[PDB]
Design a protein around this ligand. Sequence first.
Ligand SMILES: [Cu+2]
Length: 128
Amino acid sequence: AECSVDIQGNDQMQFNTNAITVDKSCKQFTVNLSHPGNLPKNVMGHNWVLSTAADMQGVVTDGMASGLDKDYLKPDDSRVIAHTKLIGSGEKDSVTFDVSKLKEGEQYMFFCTFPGHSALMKGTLTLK
Ligand SMILES: [Cu+2]
């Protein structure tokens, strides 16, 4: 089983994957995010945030009102399962989480919470 995935967030406000499959055999799953763009995090910042499909809209909405200093995330938001930090050009960050935090038959969504980005920067994550 491949228990990790390398994802990129660029200046065109896009992730390089629209779907992630987490194999059931994995105990932990790792997401390695990088920013191959030229723009700084205050204008084109990207983070990889995971939540259930049902909680996405809430996380994104409250996230934007939180500000840059809060990584565009509502402090202690229980709806967030896992997340990388907000990164800009030339930066990278990884996040590892327990696969047991996920369940079969529930749709998950990964997305960037920087203002307006989730319009394009989002995708599905499923446990199979
Ligand atoms: Cu972004």
